[PDB]
Amino acid sequence: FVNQHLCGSHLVEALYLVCGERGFFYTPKT
Amino acid sequence: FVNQHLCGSHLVEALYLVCGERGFFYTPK
Amino acid sequence: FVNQHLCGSHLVEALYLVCGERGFFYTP
Amino acid sequence: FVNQHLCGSHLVEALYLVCGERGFFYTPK
Amino acid sequence: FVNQHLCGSHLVEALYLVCGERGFFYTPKT
Amino acid sequence: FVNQHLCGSHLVEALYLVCGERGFFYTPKT
Amino acid sequence: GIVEQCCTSICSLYQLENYCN
Amino acid sequence: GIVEQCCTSICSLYQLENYCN
Amino acid sequence: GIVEQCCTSICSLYQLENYCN
Amino acid sequence: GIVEQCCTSICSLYQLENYCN
Amino acid sequence: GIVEQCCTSICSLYQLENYCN
Amino acid sequence: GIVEQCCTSICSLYQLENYCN
Ligand SMILES: [Cl-]
Ligand SMILES: [Cl-]
Ligand SMILES: [Zn+2]
Ligand SMILES: [Zn+2]
Secondary structure (H helix, E strand, O other), rough: OHHHHHHHHHHHHHHHHHHHHEEEOOOOOO | OOHHHHHHHHHHHHHHHHHHHEEEEEOOO | HHHHHHHHHHHHHHHHHHHHHOOOOOOO | OOHHHHHHHHHHHHHHHHHOOOOOEEOOO | OOHHHHHHHHHHHHHHEEEEEHEEOOOOXX | OOHHHHHHHHHHHHHHHHHHHHOEEEEXXX | HHHHHHHHOOOOHHHHHHOOO | OOHHOOOOOOOOOHHHHHHOO | OOOOOHOOOOOOHHHHHHHEE | OOHHHHHHOOOOOHHHHHHEH | OOOHHHHHOOOOOHHHHHHHH | HHHHOOOOOOOOOHHHOOOOO
């Protein structure tokens, strides 16, 4: 689903910014 | 460090593309 | 100066997420 | 849905490029 | 909804990473 | 290397907005 | 608003300029 | 997950902070 | 064309490379 | 301004909110 | 090339346009 | 760390894959 593919692109960019120093995990599968 | 800050935004976008389904962990520090 | 130019593209995306419904004025 | 939300991120980016040193106003509501 | 235009935006970013030094062509028709 | 790498990313997105329906060729070296 | 104008249909550079300061 | 949850509705930065490690 | 090929179904890295110079 | 302040050093989410309407 | 002209000083939308198909 | 490795010099796609889950 490209829609979900696009959204996740945008969600990794927001996590980057919100998490700062701590980092995050990106685990779509789920 | 803003150059690093800027580069890191681009690295997560590249990790998202490359990793796909597997996902990735991003740990700056 | 391209470095500042590249940085404000990132700052406007950040402002977009932080501000939400408030919006913002972007004045370099 | 979040279509509007995704579209707005792209619009702020296009305004940034179009407006240059002028700056711009982003007022959704 | 500008879905196609949004998709396009992401495709050129993906093509820039993938193709590297080779570059690429972007024709919205096709 | 990185600085020009980062600028090229922003460059293709500006070409995408500017060229619209005509499309474009991105060839870094050329 | 801007999202109603530019997210339903694609806006030209002339219409985006309207929001420049 | 985050997709089902933040792709069907908008997550505020406070909902996003939960996925930070 | 690219848009036809990759805007409904996700194109992999290998399909994207078909559009490299 | 925002530029001298946030392109010099990394601005937190708290600092950026001073720029919101 | 483009990189040589647009990665040191800002290229305007008019200059970028000479690169379109 | 990826920052030190890929912010100093450009990581190929193979190099970035090193950091996937
Ligand atoms: Cl999108
Ligand atoms: Cl950058
Ligand atoms: Zn998008
Ligand atoms: Zn950037």
